[PDB]
Amino acid sequence: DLTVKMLAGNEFQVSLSSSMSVSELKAQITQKIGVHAFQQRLAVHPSGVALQDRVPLASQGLGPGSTVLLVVDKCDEPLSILVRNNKGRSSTYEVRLTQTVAHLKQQVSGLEGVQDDLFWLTFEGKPLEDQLPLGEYGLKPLSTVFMNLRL
Amino acid sequence: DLTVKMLAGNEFQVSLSSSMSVSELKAQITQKIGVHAFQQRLAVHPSGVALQDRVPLASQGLGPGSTVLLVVDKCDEPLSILVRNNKGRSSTYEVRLTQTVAHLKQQVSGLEGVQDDLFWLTFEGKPLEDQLPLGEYGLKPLSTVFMNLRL
Amino acid sequence: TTQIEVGPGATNATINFEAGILECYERFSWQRALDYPGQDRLHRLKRKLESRIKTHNKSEPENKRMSLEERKAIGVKMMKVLLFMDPSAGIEGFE
Amino acid sequence: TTQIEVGPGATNATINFEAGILECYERFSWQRALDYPGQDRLHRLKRKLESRIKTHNKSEPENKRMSLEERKAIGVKMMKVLLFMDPSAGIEGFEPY
């Protein structure tokens, strides 16, 4: 088991299997306490040195029974993106990375005048999932999300 | 002639008479805005590098037209010292570096039962002055202050 | 205006965090940059803060009780971690 | 309770300082550490502060006009130097101990 320590002393445990990996640690934390992965800043205790997403946890100064530090970077600074409708017409939307893909779709529905279950969004080839926050897809100012029509 | 810039961004001028020492600069800042020397934290603009005491300002890149940054530290935290009455009996007093010498003499007066006008305090040979802060003399935990009687 | 669910440990955490907040207000006032309305917000937060610490302390064992000055130190470290986003500021704040 | 004579420029200084205080409340809030009354003081401060900025921005030239988000950056800078009582790199470039 691994111990996660947050600001103000709160603690909880995480089980890492089969092998150690930063990417998985964050996914684990997300399931435990609901903190989005892209907001997680992990550091070794008591070193205070940030973990590195690439290198596994065993290959670092980290292992079993060791403590990690979690600080949550809100990453909720407003920004604007573009969503291109089926006809090729792109419109801007004010969003925050902490809002859900579902919330962006509600914004797109109203503007584009199309029911949300009648389409899905894609960014850089891959589809966006309703339950996930926009920040998981690394969207940037005036990025172009594409609208795709169901049947 | 030098520009002092405080935390808010407000500036005021200070003309260095001769030596152009940091001690002199602080003395002028005390005369100007009333901040005691021991409370002044000075640094170069805009590097932020702190001023060096035993070094001439003209040596740290501080000539006419230069700007120094002032941060005030009250130094209000409690410490204990000793006052030795004429007999040789040392007794402990709790004080703050911001309290005046007159204030301290009031404590000594109350404990020793001697009117303040009938004695004067000394530290390391030099007299303490009524209207000056205790921080003015670099009093440390359990520094000995001697009590001197008058005719 | 979006609330974040917390647990019991957040009460004593907020008291310390806001202690540090007070310590910053105070240091700022030394710079003579704190306007009059702002000075009132300083004095009231200290008033309430002392009222909450006194109320919280009695609710907890003596060996865990802390003074206004003791909590300030903890709050300062916590604030350094948030501003620099680095546990090194830091560690005393727990991360 | 002793007071401190301020000066005209205190108004702007306090808006930025408290703008940094808000940034600290918010950041603390995401650590699941801010209790409910705390989160109330957070949102109250944000409202009050936001109205103060609009009121103060009308009287100043467009160049020195600052929005809540960019004022924050200034407030945290102040907070940094205060927390360390050290302008010395406390604001400009890194330097944490």
CSV table of C-alpha atoms in Angstrom, one decimal, chain A residues 5-151:
chain,number,residue,atom,x,y,z
A,5,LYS,CA,-0.8,12.9,2.3
A,6,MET,CA,-2.7,16.1,1.6
A,7,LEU,CA,-2.4,19.7,2.9
A,8,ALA,CA,-3.6,19.9,6.5
A,9,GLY,CA,-2.7,16.3,7.3
A,10,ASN,CA,-5.5,14.3,5.8
A,11,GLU,CA,-4.4,10.8,4.7
A,12,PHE,CA,-5.6,7.8,2.7
A,13,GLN,CA,-4.2,4.6,1.3
A,14,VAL,CA,-3.6,3.5,-2.3
A,15,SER,CA,-2.9,0.0,-3.6
A,16,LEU,CA,-0.5,-0.3,-6.6
A,17,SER,CA,-0.7,-3.4,-8.7
A,18,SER,CA,0.5,-5.1,-10.6
A,19,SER,CA,3.4,-2.8,-11.3
A,20,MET,CA,4.2,0.7,-10.2
A,21,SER,CA,3.4,3.7,-12.5
A,22,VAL,CA,2.7,7.4,-11.9
A,23,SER,CA,-0.1,7.5,-14.4
A,24,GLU,CA,-1.9,4.7,-12.5
A,25,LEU,CA,-1.3,6.3,-9.1
A,26,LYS,CA,-3.2,9.4,-10.3
A,27,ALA,CA,-6.0,7.3,-11.8
A,28,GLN,CA,-6.2,5.5,-8.4
A,29,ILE,CA,-6.4,8.8,-6.5
A,30,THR,CA,-9.1,10.0,-8.8
A,31,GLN,CA,-11.2,6.9,-8.0
A,32,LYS,CA,-10.6,7.3,-4.2
A,33,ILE,CA,-11.2,11.0,-3.6
A,34,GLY,CA,-12.5,12.3,-7.0
A,35,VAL,CA,-9.6,14.6,-7.8
A,36,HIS,CA,-9.1,14.9,-11.5
A,37,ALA,CA,-5.8,13.5,-12.7
A,38,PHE,CA,-4.7,16.6,-14.6
A,39,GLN,CA,-5.0,18.5,-11.3
A,40,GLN,CA,-2.7,16.2,-9.3
A,41,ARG,CA,0.7,17.4,-8.3
A,42,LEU,CA,2.5,14.5,-6.6
A,43,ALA,CA,5.7,14.7,-4.6
A,44,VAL,CA,7.9,12.3,-2.6
A,45,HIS,CA,7.8,12.5,1.2
A,46,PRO,CA,9.6,13.9,3.0
A,47,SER,CA,11.8,15.0,0.0
A,48,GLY,CA,9.2,17.3,-1.5
A,49,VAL,CA,10.6,16.5,-4.9
A,50,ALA,CA,7.9,16.0,-7.6
A,51,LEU,CA,7.3,12.6,-9.1
A,52,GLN,CA,7.9,12.2,-12.8
A,53,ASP,CA,5.0,10.7,-14.8
A,54,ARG,CA,7.4,8.7,-17.0
A,55,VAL,CA,9.5,6.8,-14.5
A,56,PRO,CA,7.8,4.1,-12.4
A,57,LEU,CA,7.4,4.5,-8.6
A,58,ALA,CA,9.8,1.7,-7.7
A,59,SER,CA,12.5,3.2,-9.9
A,60,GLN,CA,12.2,6.5,-7.9
A,61,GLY,CA,12.8,7.2,-4.3
A,62,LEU,CA,9.4,5.6,-3.7
A,63,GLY,CA,8.2,2.1,-2.7
A,64,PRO,CA,5.9,0.2,-0.3
A,65,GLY,CA,4.9,1.8,2.9
A,66,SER,CA,6.2,5.2,1.6
A,67,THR,CA,4.3,8.4,1.7
A,68,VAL,CA,3.5,10.7,-1.3
A,69,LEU,CA,2.3,14.3,-1.1
A,70,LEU,CA,-0.7,15.5,-3.1
A,71,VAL,CA,-1.4,19.1,-3.8
A,72,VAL,CA,-4.4,20.0,-6.0
A,73,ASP,CA,-3.9,22.5,-8.7
A,74,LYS,CA,-7.4,23.8,-9.5
A,75,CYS,CA,-6.6,24.7,-13.1
A,76,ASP,CA,-9.9,26.5,-13.5
A,77,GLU,CA,-8.7,29.6,-15.3
A,78,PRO,CA,-11.4,30.6,-17.9
A,79,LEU,CA,-10.4,30.2,-21.5
A,80,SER,CA,-12.1,30.0,-25.0
A,81,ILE,CA,-12.2,27.1,-27.4
A,82,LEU,CA,-13.7,26.4,-30.8
A,83,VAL,CA,-16.3,23.7,-31.7
A,84,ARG,CA,-16.9,23.1,-35.4
A,85,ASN,CA,-20.4,22.0,-36.4
A,86,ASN,CA,-21.3,19.5,-39.0
A,87,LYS,CA,-21.4,22.1,-41.8
A,88,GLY,CA,-17.9,23.3,-40.9
A,89,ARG,CA,-19.0,26.4,-39.0
A,90,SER,CA,-16.8,27.1,-35.9
A,91,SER,CA,-18.1,29.0,-32.9
A,92,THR,CA,-16.3,30.0,-29.7
A,93,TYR,CA,-17.3,28.8,-26.2
A,94,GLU,CA,-16.2,30.0,-22.8
A,95,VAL,CA,-15.1,27.0,-20.7
A,96,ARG,CA,-13.0,25.9,-17.8
A,97,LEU,CA,-10.9,22.8,-17.8
A,98,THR,CA,-12.7,21.7,-14.6
A,99,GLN,CA,-16.1,21.4,-16.3
A,100,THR,CA,-17.3,18.2,-17.8
A,101,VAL,CA,-17.5,17.2,-21.5
A,102,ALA,CA,-21.2,16.9,-20.8
A,103,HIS,CA,-21.4,20.6,-19.8
A,104,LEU,CA,-19.6,21.6,-23.0
A,105,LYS,CA,-22.1,19.6,-25.0
A,106,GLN,CA,-25.0,21.4,-23.3
A,107,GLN,CA,-23.4,24.6,-24.4
A,108,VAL,CA,-23.0,23.2,-27.9
A,109,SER,CA,-26.6,21.9,-28.0
A,110,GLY,CA,-28.2,25.3,-27.2
A,111,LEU,CA,-26.1,27.2,-29.7
A,112,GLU,CA,-26.1,24.7,-32.5
A,113,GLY,CA,-29.8,23.8,-31.9
A,114,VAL,CA,-29.1,20.1,-31.9
A,115,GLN,CA,-29.9,17.5,-29.1
A,116,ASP,CA,-26.8,16.4,-27.3
A,117,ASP,CA,-27.4,12.6,-27.6
A,118,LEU,CA,-27.5,13.2,-31.4
A,119,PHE,CA,-23.8,14.0,-31.5
A,120,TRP,CA,-20.4,13.6,-29.9
A,121,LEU,CA,-17.3,15.6,-29.8
A,122,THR,CA,-13.7,14.7,-30.9
A,123,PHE,CA,-10.4,16.4,-30.3
A,124,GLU,CA,-7.2,15.4,-32.1
A,125,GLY,CA,-8.8,12.3,-33.5
A,126,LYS,CA,-10.0,10.8,-30.1
A,127,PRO,CA,-13.6,11.2,-28.8
A,128,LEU,CA,-14.5,13.2,-25.7
A,129,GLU,CA,-16.3,11.4,-22.9
A,130,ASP,CA,-19.3,13.0,-21.1
A,131,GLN,CA,-18.1,12.2,-17.6
A,132,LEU,CA,-14.6,13.5,-18.0
A,133,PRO,CA,-13.4,17.1,-17.5
A,134,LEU,CA,-12.1,19.1,-20.5
A,135,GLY,CA,-8.7,19.2,-18.8
A,136,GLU,CA,-8.1,15.5,-19.4
A,137,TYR,CA,-7.8,16.3,-23.1
A,138,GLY,CA,-5.4,19.1,-22.7
A,139,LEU,CA,-7.5,21.7,-24.5
A,140,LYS,CA,-5.9,25.1,-25.3
A,141,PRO,CA,-7.2,28.6,-26.2
A,142,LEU,CA,-9.0,28.4,-29.5
A,143,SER,CA,-8.4,24.6,-29.8
A,144,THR,CA,-10.8,23.0,-32.3
A,145,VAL,CA,-13.1,20.3,-31.1
A,146,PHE,CA,-15.1,18.7,-33.9
A,147,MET,CA,-18.8,17.9,-33.8
A,148,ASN,CA,-19.9,14.4,-35.1
A,149,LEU,CA,-23.5,13.5,-35.9
A,150,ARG,CA,-25.1,10.2,-34.8
A,151,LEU,CA,-27.9,8.5,-36.7
